[PDB]
Design a protein around this nucleic acid. Structure first.
Ligand SMILES: [Mg+2]
Ligand SMILES: [Mg+2]
Ligand SMILES: [Mg+2]
Ligand SMILES: [Mg+2]
Ligand SMILES: [Mg+2]
Ligand SMILES: [Mg+2]
Ligand SMILES: [Mg+2]
Ligand SMILES: [Mg+2]
Ligand SMILES: [Mg+2]
Lengths: 176, 190, 199, 138
RNA sequence: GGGAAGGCCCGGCGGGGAAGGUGGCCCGGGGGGACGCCUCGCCGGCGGGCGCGACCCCUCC
RNA sequence: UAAGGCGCCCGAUGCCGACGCUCAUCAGACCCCAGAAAAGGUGUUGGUUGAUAUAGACAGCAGGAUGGUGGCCAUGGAAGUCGGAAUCCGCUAAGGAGUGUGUAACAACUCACCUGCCGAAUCAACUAGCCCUGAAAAUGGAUGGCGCUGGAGCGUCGGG
RNA sequence: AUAGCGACGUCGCUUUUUGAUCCUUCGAUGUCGGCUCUUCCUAUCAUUGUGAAGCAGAAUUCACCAAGCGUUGGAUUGUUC
RNA sequence: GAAGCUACCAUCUGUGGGAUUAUGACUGAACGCCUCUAAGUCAGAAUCCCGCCCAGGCGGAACGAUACGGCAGCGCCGAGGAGCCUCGGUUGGCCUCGGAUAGCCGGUCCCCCGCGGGGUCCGGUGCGGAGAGCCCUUCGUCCCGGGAAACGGGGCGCGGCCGGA
């Protein structure tokens, strides 16, 4: 996978072709976070090949569709169970993020993995994404945003658009 | 992780007053005035509460590396308050085996001359920091008293006149000679 | 038509790149008060870098080797030279359009000096980092005129304070006159207000 | 010292981006550098927004930290933010800047002509006052 | 996904839940406003003070 | 347009680019490629596993830290502290036939363990990122150079 | 065990030893030493400043910043050694 | 054996600071204690840099004199007079506080020190005492009227006084 842009969540269900052995193979459903449906289908085939004895040549994508966010206006806490490959050994972890959308949280997860462990999208295997109550949250970086009377200033505002007035007689102010 | 807010408050006594101009603090009390700036820390100082009751230090969005500065600022301010109301008295003693250490104070406590340190013909001459007064303690065979208002200045003078007397090219585990800080108290007790 | 820049608070390379581009684009640029320029990184690091530069000299004949100028103005001049094609006629002609100065000379003290926000320390560096003063670095590398320029700068500042006080007084007279004559200049003011030059 | 904080219910002015030049009300803080906001009455659909693009104003209106747009609009109308913002000096400077940008060539000439007289009268009167002050000093 | 949310009408109305707990209540302090302890200001007056003890007497934030 | 790039040299980010990580008194900076390992860090950032904490911990400041018995084999001397197995009981809020310092042996100090004050989170053992130690060659010297630390560095990414 | 050493192992660095190769030079790059002279490196013998010893002093070890300044006169041998 | 050269084979002379390394420390958090370190601070050397010393840049400064007496050449001035040749680029000016950024700017008597500097208070603060700005603004001339000015405008038109390294 190439974690291009913001990811989208896809529900993908697939099955083996009917064979003389069995008329109706069971349908298997999976949640895939992907830039588009093509890579979503590729990832589905990869995961189902690891899990069951299924291959794209001996299977078919029964359905593949984007699943939209149920409540994209409520800020939520997301717990992600994840499996990734390091330079020496592979590790399971659990990370919490804070965002409005499941796809946004997973994209945050990919960027954070790249930033903190140099792990790449082809190394990360995302396992579980769940909405987690603020009481069940356990990472302080997320927990510290759980209060009714949140209040903090913007202390040191760095001047942007530094080049539009490229030569200015003021020395800029950073306190607003 | 950067903490949203880290704060700590310091209570100041009634006999002393505190005035701050940005990040520099001025403490005025019975024994004098102490000024100290904190422009190299980059946190928020607030003299909240009428009757000048408390001084609060705030730090917004700081990692653990600069979260440590809050308590060090508060400790510095408390030390300034203590040195203004009570003052700092560093008492030190001279330890020798055979040759007595002859210490004489001149410039009314600003210069210290040390002679006969291990039969030394050389004379050690150490100058105190401005605002630190040296004296030879009464009711004691051999002991020096450093009086001051700034703990940093007093302790720096003590360290200066302690490191001025070090044994060279010999076993310092046997040649335990020189002047060492016996204790660090206040000019007047509470 | 000449661009007069003030060095105080600006970073060395960040200012040098902009100056070099402006000079190449044909504009005449004079940068002033070069000893106020600062460099990122701590003072010991920057001093070590300059000492490493000092160590580079031609073994057989140092008189022909690299020339290590000690004045802050010439240091800034050389780092600007490093960003120009000075081996060509175009590069040399460009380099001849730049003037550097320690302190602020009489041709320019009575002028308004420009500022480049894209190269300012307060904009480009977070407050927790360490920086070094080019003036101090040059002085303890072997610049011999730190004190003289300091006294001259003090004199210039104390003259500019008098000039600024006079400017404040004269303007205050201007504002008092404005509120005095509002009665008969009111009809000339509503037009500016409606066209948004006075609100 | 800090006077403008980021809490629930503060009115902020969006500087750049899609909704540039519009007021908005902070509903929640999503993360360190993102807030969930909406301008129920200033025509800004509820959405997330980075802190880098809003400038804090000194207007606070009370509602719970996740109240719906109905109650946000109720509080906005009750506090009557629009007229107070239009009356503050900040919006006056913005509106004057917009006027100067919109000014065409004929009004540019008229402004030049008016400014000529304004400056001439002020300069003459300033000269009179300076001479009077010099005489008073003497 | 015959769009997912969202908007308006307190839509009405069914019951249930805790918390990033609104009121209310209890504890604590920073307070103040009636200023009820001095000091000046004009024995009566108001304004000056950028006054001065309060304290559960409340009383508000 | 490809590959590669867009601080200046040097055409192109003079985007109000997004999220993080990193301070180096030897920083780092792009296939071939032009320089480094085992082993370490209470530098900092993530993660895994196990503990104990209002029956009041972790510090920290103070009080105790006992009898059989100087247990048996021993050595010239071994009282607990050089040596060989075991390691009991009553008193107990608790004390090990002992964690260490000390003497030839004691003595003495000290620890395990339990109490008083303090009143909410605290301990480890691993694992992986960046940085640091490991890291020494000869003409002066090379991320291409200048230089760069709210990056012009590193990782994941978006428009132009 | 770790003042000082360090077995059985195991990871490196250097090109002042020798190898291995045969890329350049066979219409020729004068092939050992010594003498003379300059400069450079540090893996520091001495000197300056330090830290640790099974450092009482003296003497002597181990380690750190460090190449600024010194590192000789002779018998034997063509010698380098 | 003069003079002159000349020898540790004679004789004379050979220097002071600064920032700092290693290291030892102060205050002091992180981590209730502790800690040379994280912020801040101190001492510190045959090292490094500079001074002393040698040279003095397609680098400057101050000052002196500046071309006959038959011719003449020169220097300064006449907002000195026409021009001729050649080299080009440009196509309105901004004449100024210092500086901070986890803060600034401007007024102020209501006070205190030496007109200036502090205190209180009042105003502004995505900088309307703004460089996202300010100033000047040019088709020209002729009549009459209104607005501003009568103190103003223009004068190598003037003679002085200060203002500058
Ligand atoms: Mg010795
Ligand atoms: Mg390139
Ligand atoms: Mg030859
Ligand atoms: Mg030949
Ligand atoms: Mg070495
Ligand atoms: Mg020194
Ligand atoms: Mg140190
Ligand atoms: Mg020092
Ligand atoms: Mg022309």
């Amino acid at each position: 996978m190439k974690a291009s842009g913001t990811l989208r969540e896809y529900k993908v269900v697939g099955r083996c072709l009917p064979t003389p052995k069995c008329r109706t193979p069971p349908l298997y459903r999976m949640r895939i976070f992907a830039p588009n449906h093509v890579v979503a289908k590729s990832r589905f085939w990869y995961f189902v090949s690891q899990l069951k004895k299924m291959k794209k040549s001996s299977g078919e994508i029964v359905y593949c569709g984007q699943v939209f966010e149920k409540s994209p206006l409520r800020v939520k806490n997301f717990g992600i169970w994840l499996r990734y490959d390091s330079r020496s050994g592979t590790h399971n972890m659990y990370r919490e993020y804070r965002d409005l959308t499941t796809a946004g949280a997973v994209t945050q997860c990919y960027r954070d993995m790249g930033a903190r462990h140099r792990a790449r999208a082809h190394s990360i295997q995302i396992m579980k994404v769940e909405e987690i109550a603020a009481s069940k949250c356990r990472r302080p970086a997320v927990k510290q945003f759980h209060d009714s009377k949140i209040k903090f200033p913007l202390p040191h505002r760095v001047l942007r658009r530094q080049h539009k007035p490229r030569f200015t007689t003021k020395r800029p102010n950073t306190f607003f | 992780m950067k903490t949203i807010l880290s704060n700590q408050t310091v209570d100041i006594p009634e006999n002393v007053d505190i005035s701050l101009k940005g990040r520099t603090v001025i403490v005025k009390g019975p024994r004098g005035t102490l000024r100290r700036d904190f422009n190299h820390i980059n946190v928020e100082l607030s003299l909240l509460g009428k009757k000048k009751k408390r001084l609060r230090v705030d730090k917004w969005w700081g990692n653990r590396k600069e979260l440590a500065t809050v308590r060090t600022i508060c400790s510095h301010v408390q030390n300034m308050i203590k040195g203004v109301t009570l003052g700092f008295r560093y008492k030190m003693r001279s330890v020798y085996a055979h040759f007595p250490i002859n210490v004489v104070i001149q410039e009314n406590g600003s210069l210290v001359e040390i002679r006969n340190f291990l039969g030394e013909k050389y004379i050690r001459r150490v100058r105190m920091r401005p605002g630190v007064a040296c004296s030879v303690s009464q009711a004691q065979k051999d002991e020096l008293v450093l009086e001051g208002n700034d703990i940093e200045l007093v302790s720096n003078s003590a360290a200066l006149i302690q490191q001025a007397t070090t044994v060279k090219n010999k076993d310092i585990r046997k040649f335990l000679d020189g002047i060492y800080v016996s204790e660090k108290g206040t000019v007047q007790q509470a | 038509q000449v661009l007069v820049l003030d060095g105080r608070g600006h970073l060395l390379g960040r200012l040098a790149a902009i100056v070099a581009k402006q000079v190449l684009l044909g504009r005449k640029v004079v940068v002033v008060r070069c000893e106020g320029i600062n460099i990122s990184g701590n003072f010991y690091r920057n001093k070590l870098k300059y000492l490493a530069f000092l160590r580079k000299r031609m073994n057989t004949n140092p008189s022909r080797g690299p020339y290590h100028f000690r004045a802050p103005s010439r240091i800034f001049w050389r780092t600007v030279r490093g960003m120009l094609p000075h081996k060509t006629k175009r590069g040399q002609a460009a380099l001849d359009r730049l003037k550097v100065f320690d302190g602020i000379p009489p041709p320019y003290d009575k002028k308004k000096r420009m500022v480049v926000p894209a190269a300012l320390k307060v904009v480009r560096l977070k407050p927790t980092r360490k920086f070094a003063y080019l003036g101090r670095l040059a002085h303890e590398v072997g610049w011999k005129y730190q004190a003289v320029t300091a006294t001259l700068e003090e004199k210039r500042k104390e003259k500019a304070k008098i000039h600024y006080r006079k400017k404040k007084q004269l303007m205050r007279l201007r504002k008092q006159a404005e509120k005095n004559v509002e009665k008969k200049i009111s009809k000339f003011t509503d037009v500016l207000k409606t066209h948004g030059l006075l609100v | 010292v800090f006077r403008r904080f980021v809490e629930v219910g503060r009115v902020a002015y969006v500087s750049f981006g899609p909704h540039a030049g519009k007021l908005v009300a902070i509903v929640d803080v999503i993360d360190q550098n993102r807030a969930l906001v909406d301008g129920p009455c200033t025509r800004v659909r509820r959405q997330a927004m980075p802190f880098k693009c809003m400038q804090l104003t000194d207007f606070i209106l009370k509602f719970p930290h996740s109240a719906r747009q109905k109650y946000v609009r109720k509080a906005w109308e009750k506090a009557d933010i629009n007229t107070k913002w239009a009356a503050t000096r900040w919006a006056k400077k913005i509106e004057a800047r917009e006027r100067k940008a919109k000014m065409t060539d004929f009004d540019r000439y008229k402004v030049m002509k008016a400014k000529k007289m304004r400056n001439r009268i002020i300069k003459n009167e300033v000269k009179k006052l300076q001479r009077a002050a010099l005489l008073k000093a003497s």
